mmCIF file of C-alpha atoms and ligand atoms in Angstrom:
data_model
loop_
_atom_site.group_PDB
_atom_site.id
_atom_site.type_symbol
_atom_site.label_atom_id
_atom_site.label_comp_id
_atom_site.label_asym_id
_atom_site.label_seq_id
_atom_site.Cartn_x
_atom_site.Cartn_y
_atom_site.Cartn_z
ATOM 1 C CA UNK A 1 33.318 153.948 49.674
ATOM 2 C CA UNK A 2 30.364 155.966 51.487
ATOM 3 C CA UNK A 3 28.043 157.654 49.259
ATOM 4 C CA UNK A 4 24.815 157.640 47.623
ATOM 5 C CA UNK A 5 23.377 154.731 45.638
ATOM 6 C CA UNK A 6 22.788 155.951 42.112
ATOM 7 C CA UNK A 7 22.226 154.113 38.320
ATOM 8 C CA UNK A 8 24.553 155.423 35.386
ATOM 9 C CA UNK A 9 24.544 153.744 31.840
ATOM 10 C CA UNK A 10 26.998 152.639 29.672
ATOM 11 C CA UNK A 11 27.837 150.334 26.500
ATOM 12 C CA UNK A 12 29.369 146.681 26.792
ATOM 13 C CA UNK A 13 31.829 144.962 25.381
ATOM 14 C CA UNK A 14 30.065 143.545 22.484
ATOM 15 C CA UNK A 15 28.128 147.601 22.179
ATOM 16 C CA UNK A 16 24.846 146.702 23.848
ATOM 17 C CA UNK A 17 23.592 149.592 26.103
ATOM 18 C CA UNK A 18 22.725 148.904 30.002
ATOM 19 C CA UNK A 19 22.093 150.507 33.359
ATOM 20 C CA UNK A 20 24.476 150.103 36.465
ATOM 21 C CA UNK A 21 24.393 150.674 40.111
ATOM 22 C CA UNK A 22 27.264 152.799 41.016
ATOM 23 C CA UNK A 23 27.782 155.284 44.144
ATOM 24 C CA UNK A 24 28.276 158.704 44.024
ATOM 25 C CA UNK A 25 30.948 160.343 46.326
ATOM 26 C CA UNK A 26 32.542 163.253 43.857
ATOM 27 C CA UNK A 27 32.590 160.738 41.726
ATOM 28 C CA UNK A 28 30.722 158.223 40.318
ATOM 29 C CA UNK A 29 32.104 154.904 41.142
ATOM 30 C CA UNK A 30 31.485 150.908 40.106
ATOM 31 C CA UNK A 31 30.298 150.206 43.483
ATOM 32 C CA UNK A 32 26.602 148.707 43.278
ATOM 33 C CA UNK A 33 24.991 148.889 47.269
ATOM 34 C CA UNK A 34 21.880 146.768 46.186
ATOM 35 C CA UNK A 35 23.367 143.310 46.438
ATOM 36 C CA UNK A 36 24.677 142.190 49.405
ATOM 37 C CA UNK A 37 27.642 143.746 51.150
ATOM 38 C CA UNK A 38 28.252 145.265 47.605
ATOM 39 C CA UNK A 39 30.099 144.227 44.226
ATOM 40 C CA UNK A 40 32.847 146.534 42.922
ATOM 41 C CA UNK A 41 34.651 147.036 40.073
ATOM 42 C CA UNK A 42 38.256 147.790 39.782
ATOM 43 C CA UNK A 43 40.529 149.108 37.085
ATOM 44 C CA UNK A 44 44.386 147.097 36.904
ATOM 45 C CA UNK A 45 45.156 149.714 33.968
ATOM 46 C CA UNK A 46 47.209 146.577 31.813
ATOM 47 C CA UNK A 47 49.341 146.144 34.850
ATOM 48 C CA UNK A 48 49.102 142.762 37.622
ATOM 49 C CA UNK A 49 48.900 144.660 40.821
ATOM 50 C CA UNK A 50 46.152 143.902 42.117
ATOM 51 C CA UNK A 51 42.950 144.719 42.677
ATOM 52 C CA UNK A 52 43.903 148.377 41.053
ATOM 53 C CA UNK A 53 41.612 151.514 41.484
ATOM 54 C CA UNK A 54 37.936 151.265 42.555
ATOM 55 C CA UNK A 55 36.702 152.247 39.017
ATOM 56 C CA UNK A 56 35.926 156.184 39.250
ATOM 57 C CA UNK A 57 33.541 158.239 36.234
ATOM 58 C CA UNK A 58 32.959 161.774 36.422
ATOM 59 C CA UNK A 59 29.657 161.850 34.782
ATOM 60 C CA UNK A 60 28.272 158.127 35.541
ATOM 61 C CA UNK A 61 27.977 157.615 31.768
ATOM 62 C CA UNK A 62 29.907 154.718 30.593
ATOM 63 C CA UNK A 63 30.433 155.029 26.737
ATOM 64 C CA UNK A 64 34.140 155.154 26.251
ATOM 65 C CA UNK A 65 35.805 151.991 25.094
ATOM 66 C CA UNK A 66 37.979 152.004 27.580
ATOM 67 C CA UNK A 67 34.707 151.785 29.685
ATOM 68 C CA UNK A 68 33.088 148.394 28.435
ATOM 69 C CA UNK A 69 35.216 145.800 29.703
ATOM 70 C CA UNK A 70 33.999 147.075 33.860
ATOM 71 C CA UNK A 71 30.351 148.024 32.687
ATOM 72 C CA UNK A 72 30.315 143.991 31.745
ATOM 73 C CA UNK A 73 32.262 142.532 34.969
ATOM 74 C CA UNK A 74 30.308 144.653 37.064
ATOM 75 C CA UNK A 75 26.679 144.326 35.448
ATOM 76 C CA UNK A 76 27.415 140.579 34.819
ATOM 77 C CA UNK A 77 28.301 140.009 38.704
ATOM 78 C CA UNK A 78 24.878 141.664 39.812
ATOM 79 C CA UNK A 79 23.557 138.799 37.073
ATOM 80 C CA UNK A 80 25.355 135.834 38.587
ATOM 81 C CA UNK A 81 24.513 137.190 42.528
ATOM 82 C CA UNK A 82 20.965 137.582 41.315
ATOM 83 C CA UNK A 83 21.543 133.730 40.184
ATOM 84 C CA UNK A 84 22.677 132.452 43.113
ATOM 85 C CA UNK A 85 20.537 134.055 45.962
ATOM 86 C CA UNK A 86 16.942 134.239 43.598
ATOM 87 C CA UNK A 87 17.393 130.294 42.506
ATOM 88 C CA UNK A 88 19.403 128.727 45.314
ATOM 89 C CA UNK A 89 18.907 130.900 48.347
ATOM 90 C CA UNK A 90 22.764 131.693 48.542
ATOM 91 C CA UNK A 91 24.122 134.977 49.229
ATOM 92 C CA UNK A 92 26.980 135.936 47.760
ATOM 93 C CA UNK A 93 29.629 133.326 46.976
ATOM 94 C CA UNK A 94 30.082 132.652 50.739
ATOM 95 C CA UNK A 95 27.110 132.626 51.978
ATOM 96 C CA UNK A 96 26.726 135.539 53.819
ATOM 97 C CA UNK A 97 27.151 138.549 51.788
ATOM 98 C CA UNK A 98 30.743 139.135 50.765
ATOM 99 C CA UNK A 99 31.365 141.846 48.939
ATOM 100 C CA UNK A 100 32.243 140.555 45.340
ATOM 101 C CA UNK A 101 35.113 142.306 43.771
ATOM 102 C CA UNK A 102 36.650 142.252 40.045
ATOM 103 C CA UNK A 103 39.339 143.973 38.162
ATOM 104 C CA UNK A 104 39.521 144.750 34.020
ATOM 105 C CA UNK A 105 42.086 145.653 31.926
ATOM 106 C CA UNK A 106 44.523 143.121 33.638
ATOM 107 C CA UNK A 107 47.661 142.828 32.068
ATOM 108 C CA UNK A 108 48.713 143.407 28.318
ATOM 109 C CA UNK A 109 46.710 141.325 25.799
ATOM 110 C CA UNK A 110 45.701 138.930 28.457
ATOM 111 C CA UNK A 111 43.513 135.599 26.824
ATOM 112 C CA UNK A 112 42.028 134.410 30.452
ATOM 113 C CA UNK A 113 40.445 135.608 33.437
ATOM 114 C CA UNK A 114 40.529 133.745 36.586
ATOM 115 C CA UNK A 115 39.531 133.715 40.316
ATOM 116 C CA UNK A 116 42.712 134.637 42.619
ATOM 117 C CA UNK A 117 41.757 133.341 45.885
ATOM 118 C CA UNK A 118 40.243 136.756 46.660
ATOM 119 C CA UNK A 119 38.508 138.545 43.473
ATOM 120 C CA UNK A 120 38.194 138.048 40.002
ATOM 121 C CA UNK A 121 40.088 139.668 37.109
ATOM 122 C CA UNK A 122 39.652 140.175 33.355
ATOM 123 C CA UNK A 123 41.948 140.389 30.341
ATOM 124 C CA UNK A 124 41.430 142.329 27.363
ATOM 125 C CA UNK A 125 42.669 139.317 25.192
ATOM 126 C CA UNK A 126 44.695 140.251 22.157
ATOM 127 C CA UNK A 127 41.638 140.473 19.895
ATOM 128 C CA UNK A 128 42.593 137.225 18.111
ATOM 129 C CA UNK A 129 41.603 134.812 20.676
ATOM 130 C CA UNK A 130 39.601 136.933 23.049
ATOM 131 C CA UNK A 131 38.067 140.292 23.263
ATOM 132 C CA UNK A 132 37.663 141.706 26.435
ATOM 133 C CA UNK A 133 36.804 138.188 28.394
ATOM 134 C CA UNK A 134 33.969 140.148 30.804
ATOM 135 C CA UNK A 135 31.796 140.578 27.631
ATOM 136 C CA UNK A 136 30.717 136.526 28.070
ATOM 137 C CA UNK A 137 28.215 136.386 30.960
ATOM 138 C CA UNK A 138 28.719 133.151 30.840
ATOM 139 C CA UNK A 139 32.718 133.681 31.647
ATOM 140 C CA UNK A 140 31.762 136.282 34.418
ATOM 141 C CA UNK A 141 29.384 133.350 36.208
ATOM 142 C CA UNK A 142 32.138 130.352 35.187
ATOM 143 C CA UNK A 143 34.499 132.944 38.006
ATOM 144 C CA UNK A 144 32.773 133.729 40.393
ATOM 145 C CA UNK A 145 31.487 129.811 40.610
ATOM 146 C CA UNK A 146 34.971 129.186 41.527
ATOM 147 C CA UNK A 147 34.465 131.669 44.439
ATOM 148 C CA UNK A 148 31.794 129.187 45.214
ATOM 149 C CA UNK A 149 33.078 126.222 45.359
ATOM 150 C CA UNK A 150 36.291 127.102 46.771
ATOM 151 C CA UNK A 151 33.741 128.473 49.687
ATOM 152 C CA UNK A 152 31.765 125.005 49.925
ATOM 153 C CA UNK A 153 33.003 121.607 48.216
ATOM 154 C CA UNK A 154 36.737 122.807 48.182
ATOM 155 C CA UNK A 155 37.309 121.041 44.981
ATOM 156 C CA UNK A 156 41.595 120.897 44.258
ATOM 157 C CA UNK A 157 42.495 122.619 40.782
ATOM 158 C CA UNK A 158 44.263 119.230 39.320
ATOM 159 C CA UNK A 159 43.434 116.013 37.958
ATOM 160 C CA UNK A 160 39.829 114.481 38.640
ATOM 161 C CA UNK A 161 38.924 117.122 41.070
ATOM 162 C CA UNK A 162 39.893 120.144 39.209
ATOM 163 C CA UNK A 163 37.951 118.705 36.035
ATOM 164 C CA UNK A 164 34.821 118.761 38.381
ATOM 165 C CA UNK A 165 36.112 122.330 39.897
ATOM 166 C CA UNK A 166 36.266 123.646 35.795
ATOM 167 C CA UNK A 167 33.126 121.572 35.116
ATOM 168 C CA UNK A 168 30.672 123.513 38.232
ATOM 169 C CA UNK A 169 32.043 126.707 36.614
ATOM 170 C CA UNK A 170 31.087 126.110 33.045
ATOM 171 C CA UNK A 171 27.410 124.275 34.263
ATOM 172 C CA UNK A 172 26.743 127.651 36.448
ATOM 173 C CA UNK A 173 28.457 129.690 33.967
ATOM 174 C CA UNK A 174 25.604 128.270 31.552
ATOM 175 C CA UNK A 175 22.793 128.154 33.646
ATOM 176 C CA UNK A 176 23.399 131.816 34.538
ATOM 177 C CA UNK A 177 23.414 132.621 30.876
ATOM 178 C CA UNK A 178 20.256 130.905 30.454
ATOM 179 C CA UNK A 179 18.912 133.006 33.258
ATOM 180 C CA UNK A 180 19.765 136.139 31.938
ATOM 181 C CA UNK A 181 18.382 134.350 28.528
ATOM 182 C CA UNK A 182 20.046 136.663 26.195
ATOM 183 C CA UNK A 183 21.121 134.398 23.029
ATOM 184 C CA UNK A 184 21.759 131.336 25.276
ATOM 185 C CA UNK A 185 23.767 128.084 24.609
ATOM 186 C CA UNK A 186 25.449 125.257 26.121
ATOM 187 C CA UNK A 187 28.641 126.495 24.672
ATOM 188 C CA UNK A 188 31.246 128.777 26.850
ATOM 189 C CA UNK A 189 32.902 131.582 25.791
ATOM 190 C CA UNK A 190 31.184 132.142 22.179
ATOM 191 C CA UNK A 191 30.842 135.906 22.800
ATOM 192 C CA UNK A 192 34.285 136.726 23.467
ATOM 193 C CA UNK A 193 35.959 134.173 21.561
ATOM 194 C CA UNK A 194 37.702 134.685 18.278
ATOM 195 C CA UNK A 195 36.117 137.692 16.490
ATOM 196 C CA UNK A 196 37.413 136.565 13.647
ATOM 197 C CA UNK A 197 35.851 133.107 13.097
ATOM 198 C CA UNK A 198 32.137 133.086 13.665
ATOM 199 C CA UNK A 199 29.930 130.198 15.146
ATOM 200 C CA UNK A 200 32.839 128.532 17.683
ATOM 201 C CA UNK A 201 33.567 128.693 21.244
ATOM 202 C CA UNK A 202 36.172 127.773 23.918
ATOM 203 C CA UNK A 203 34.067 124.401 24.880
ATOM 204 C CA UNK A 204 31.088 123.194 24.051
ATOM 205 C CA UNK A 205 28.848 121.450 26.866
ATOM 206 C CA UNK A 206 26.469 119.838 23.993
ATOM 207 C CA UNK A 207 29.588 118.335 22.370
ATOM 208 C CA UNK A 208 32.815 118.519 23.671
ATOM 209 C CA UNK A 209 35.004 116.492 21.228
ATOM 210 C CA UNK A 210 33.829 119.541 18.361
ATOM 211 C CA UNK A 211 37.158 121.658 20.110
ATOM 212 C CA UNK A 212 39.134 118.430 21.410
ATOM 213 C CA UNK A 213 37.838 117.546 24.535
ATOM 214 C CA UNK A 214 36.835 114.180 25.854
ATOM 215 C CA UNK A 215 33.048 113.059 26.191
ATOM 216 C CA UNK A 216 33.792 109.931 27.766
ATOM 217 C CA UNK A 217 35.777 108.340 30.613
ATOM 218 C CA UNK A 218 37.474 106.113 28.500
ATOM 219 C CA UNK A 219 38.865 109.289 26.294
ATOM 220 C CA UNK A 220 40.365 111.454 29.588
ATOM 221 C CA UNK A 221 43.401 112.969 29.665
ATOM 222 C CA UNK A 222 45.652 111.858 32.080
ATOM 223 C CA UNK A 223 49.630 113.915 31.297
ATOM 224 C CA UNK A 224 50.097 116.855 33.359
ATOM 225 C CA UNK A 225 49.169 119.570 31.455
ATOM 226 C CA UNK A 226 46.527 122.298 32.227
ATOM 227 C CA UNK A 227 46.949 120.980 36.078
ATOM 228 C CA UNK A 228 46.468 117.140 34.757
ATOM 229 C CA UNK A 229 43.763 118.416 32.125
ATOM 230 C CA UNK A 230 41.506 120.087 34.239
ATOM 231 C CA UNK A 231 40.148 122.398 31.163
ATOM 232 C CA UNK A 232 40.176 119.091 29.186
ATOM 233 C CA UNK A 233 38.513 116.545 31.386
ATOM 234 C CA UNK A 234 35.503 118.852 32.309
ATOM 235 C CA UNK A 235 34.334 117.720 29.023
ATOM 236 C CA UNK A 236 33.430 114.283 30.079
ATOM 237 C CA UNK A 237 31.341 115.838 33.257
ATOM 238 C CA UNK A 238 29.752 119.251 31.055
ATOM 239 C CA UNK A 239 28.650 116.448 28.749
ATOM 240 C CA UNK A 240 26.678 114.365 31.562
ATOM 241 C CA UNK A 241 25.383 117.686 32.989
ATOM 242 C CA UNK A 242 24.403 118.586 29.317
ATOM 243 C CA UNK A 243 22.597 114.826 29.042
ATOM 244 C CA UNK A 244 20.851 115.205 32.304
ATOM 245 C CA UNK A 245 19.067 118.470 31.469
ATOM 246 C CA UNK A 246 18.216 118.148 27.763
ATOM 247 C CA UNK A 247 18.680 114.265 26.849
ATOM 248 C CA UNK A 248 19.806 112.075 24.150
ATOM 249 C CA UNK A 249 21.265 109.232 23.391
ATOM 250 C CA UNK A 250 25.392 109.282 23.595
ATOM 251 C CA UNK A 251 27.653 106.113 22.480
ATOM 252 C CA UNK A 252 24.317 104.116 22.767
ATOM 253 C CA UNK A 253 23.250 105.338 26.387
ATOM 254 C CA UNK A 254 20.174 106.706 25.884
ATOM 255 C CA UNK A 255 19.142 109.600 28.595
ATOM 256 C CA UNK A 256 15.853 111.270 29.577
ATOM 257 C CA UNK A 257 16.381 115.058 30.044
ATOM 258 C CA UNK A 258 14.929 116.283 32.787
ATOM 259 C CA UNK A 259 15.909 120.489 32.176
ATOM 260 C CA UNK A 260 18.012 122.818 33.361
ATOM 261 C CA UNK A 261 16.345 124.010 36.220
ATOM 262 C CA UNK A 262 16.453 120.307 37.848
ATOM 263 C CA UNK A 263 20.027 119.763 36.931
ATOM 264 C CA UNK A 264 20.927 123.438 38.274
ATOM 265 C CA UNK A 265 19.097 121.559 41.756
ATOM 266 C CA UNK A 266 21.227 118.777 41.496
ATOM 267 C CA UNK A 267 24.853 119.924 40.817
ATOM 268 C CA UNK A 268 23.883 122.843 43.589
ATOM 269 C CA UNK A 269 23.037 120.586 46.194
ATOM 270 C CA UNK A 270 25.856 117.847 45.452
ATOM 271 C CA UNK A 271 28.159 121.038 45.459
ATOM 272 C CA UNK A 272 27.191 122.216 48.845
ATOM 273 C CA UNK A 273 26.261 119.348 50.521
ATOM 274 C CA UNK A 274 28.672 116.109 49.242
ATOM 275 C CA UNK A 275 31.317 116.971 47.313
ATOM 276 C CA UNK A 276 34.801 117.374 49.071
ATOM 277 C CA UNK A 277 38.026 119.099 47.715
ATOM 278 C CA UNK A 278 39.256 115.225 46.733
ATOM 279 C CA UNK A 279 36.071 113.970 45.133
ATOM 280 C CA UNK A 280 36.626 111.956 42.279
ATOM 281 C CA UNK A 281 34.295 111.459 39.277
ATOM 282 C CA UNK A 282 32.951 108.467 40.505
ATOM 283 C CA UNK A 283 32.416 109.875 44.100
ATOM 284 C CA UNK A 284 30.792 112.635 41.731
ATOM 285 C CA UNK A 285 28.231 110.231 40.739
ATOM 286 C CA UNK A 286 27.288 109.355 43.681
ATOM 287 C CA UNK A 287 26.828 112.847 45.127
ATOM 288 C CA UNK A 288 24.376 113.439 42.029
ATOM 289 C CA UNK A 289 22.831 109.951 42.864
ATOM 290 C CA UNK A 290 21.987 111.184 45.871
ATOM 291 C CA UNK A 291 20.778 114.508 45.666
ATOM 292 C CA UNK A 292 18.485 114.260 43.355
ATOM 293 C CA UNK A 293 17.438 111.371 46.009
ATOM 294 C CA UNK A 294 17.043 114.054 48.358
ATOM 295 C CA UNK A 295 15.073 115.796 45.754
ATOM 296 C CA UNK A 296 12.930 114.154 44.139
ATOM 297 C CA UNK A 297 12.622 110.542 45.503
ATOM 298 C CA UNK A 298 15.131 107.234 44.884
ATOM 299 C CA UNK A 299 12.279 105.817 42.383
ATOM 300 C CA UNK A 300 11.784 109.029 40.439
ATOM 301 C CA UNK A 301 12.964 109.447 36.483
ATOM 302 C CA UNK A 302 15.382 112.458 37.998
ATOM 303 C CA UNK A 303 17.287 110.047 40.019
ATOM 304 C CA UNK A 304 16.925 107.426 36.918
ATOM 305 C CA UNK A 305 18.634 110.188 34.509
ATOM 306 C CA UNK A 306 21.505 111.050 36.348
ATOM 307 C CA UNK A 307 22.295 107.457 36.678
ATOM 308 C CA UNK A 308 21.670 107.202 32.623
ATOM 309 C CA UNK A 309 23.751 110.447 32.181
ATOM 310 C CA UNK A 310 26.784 108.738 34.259
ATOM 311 C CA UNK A 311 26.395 105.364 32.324
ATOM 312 C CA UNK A 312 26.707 107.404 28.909
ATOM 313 C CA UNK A 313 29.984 109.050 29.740
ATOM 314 C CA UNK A 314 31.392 105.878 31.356
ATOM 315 C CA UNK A 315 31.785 107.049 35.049
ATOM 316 C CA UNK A 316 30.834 104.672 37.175
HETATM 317 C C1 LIG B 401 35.648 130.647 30.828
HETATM 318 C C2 LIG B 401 36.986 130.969 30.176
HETATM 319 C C3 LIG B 401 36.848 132.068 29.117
HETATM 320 C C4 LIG B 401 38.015 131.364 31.233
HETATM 321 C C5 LIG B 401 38.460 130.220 32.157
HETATM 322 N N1 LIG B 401 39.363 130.833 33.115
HETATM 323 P P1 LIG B 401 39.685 129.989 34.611
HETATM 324 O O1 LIG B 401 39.268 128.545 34.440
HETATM 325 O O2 LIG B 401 39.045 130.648 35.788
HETATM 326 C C6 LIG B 401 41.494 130.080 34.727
HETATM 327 N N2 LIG B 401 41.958 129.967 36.084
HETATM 328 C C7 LIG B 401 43.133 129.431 36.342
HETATM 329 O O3 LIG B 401 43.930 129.020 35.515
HETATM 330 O O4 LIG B 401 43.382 129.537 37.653
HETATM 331 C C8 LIG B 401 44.724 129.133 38.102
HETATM 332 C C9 LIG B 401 44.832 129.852 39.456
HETATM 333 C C10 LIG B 401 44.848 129.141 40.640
HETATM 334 C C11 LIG B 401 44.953 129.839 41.853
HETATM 335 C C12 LIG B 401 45.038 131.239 41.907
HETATM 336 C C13 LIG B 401 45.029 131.957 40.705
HETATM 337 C C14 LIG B 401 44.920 131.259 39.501
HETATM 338 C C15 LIG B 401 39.129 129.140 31.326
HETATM 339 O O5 LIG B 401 38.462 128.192 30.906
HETATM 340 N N3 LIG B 401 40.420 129.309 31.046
HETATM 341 C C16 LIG B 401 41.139 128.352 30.216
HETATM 342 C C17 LIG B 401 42.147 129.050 29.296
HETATM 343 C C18 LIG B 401 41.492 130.102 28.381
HETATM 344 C C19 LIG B 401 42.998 127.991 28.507
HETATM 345 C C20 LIG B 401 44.166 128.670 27.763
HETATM 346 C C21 LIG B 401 43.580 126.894 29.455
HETATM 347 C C22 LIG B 401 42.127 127.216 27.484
HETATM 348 CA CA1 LIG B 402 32.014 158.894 31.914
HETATM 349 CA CA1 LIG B 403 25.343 132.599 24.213
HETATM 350 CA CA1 LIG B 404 27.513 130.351 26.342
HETATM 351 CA CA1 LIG B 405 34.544 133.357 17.562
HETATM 352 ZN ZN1 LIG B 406 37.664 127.915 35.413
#
């Protein structure tokens, strides 16, 4: 909408207080001008129409509890755009500035959120497996990475592609959580998961077998499930990301971390640059391989540590 740029506050999901960029035209709406061609926050009202309302506040405070779940999607996009154009030049998940748009209160006691080809929306959850799902910065970043990719490598939700697709959403989704370095982890979804059971999370990057999921080749899933185990097999790649940045030594493989701020490099420019909407994991490999030979040299330890990282989870 046209109006004037203006900052109103409000409480989260999880009760922590923030400011927000909103526009004022009669009323105050979630409709932040000072990113790009804009992000904007939309209200589905626990229906599936989508996108809903452009989220409207008389008074630009943002206290109610109905509030929380859009003061999170929206502040958390500014987060992740902030990400992506201060760290790897990109603007927007396109490229050039498109307007980012989510929607909350999707559906009744909704336990996902998701990336529709257009926008990204929110459950609520049920409050036994998820609270509102916006509250995790690290979920808001894991969506709007699949804006991302879809806009560059292309990468086909199923089977070996789709666990790389899942896999660039929960390494960004992480890396912008370390950004915002608020309580950061290499786990996803620990601040919206399961209120009732303390210390667990959706995944874990650092060890994905603790919740089921493979952490080597030889362990994938490979039934048709989950789009042929896309949420599943993303464990064997989140744990190679994990090894490249931070090291250690996995079924014998021992790996050199080289941080997060190289592997964020990496996986960006293999995303942009190599990967294609049928890579496999091998043909992941190699795109790592070979970006961090762009980076940083063929004889250097980055390139040396990817390799290592690959060996360890038995993708060769
Ligand atoms: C980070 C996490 C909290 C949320 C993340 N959502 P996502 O991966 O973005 C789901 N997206 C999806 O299923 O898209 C299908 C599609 C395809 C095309 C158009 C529209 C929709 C996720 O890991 N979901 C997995 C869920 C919870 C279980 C039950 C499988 C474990
Ligand atoms: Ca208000
Ligand atoms: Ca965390
Ligand atoms: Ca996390
Ligand atoms: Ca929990
Ligand atoms: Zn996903």
């Amino acid at each position: 909408i046209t109006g004037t740029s203006t900052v109103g506050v409000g409480r989260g999901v999880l009760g922590d207080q923030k400011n927000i960029n909103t526009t004022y035209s009669t009323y105050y709406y979630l409709q932040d001008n000072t990113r790009g061609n804009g992000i904007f926050t939309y209200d589905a009202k626990y229906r599936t129409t989508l996108p809903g309302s452009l989220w409207a506040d008389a008074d630009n405070q943002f206290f109610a509890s109905y509030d929380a779940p859009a003061v999170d999607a929206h502040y958390y996009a500014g987060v992740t755009y902030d990400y992506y154009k201060n760290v790897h030049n990109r603007l927007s998940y396109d490229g050039n500035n498109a307007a980012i748009r989510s929607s909350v209160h999707y559906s009744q006691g909704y336990n996902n959120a998701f990336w529709n080809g257009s926008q990204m929306v929110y459950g609520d959850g049920d409050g036994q497996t998820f609270i509102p799902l916006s509250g995790g910065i690290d979920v808001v970043a894991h969506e709007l990475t699949h804006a991302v990719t879809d806009y560059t490598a292309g990468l086909i939700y199923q089977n070996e592609s789709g666990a790389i697709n899942e896999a660039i959403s929960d390494i960004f989704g992480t890396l912008v959580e370390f950004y915002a370095n608020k309580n950061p982890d290499w786990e996803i979804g620990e601040d919206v998961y399961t209120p009732g059971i303390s210390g667990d999370s959706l995944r874990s990057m650092s060890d994905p077998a603790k919740y089921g999921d493979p952490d080597h080749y030889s362990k994938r899933y490979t039934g048709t499930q989950d789009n042929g185990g896309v949420h599943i097999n993303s464990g064997i790649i989140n744990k190679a990301a994990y090894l490249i940045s931070q090291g250690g030594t996995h079924y014998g493989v021992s790996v050199v971390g080289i941080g997060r701020d190289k592997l964020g490099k990496i996986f960006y420019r293999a995303l942009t640059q190599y990967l294609t909407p049928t890579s496999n994991f091998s043909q992941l490999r190699a795109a790592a391989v070979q970006s961090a030979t762009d980076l940083y040299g063929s004889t250097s330890q980055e390139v040396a540590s990817v390799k290592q990282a690959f060996d360890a989870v038995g993708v060769k």
